[PDB]
Amino acid sequence: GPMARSLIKTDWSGSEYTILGANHYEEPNTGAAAQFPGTMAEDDGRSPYIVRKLRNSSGKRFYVFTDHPQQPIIWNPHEEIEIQFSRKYLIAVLTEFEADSKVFTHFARRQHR
Ligand SMILES: [Mg+2]
Ligand SMILES: [Mg+2]
């Protein structure tokens, strides 16, 4: 795939998890099959976050985790939202069911193994 992608799909204990990097890029209006199109970030050093404005280009409803403990946010099909990726992690964990944010820690640990 192109270098611009930063996206992993994996199965864990019977459910699928999408791990989205804060540096994922798919150009809006790409002719390729797109999943999370949107421009590159707001990167303000005064902020503990990097913000990405992305569209969910699918028929999936996601619960999105960027830290733990946290209540997830909900990302419906075709909607454009701003995700606040934490500078600590620079990933978001996406699931199609309401998981507990402890799932985030599982992937955060694995990122640096
Ligand atoms: Mg890449
Ligand atoms: Mg925390």
From TrEMBL:
Mg(2+) 1 binds at residue 5. Mg(2+) 2 binds at residue 68. Keywords: Metal-binding, Signal. GO terms for molecular function: metal ion binding. It comes from the Eukaryota. This is Uncharacterized protein.
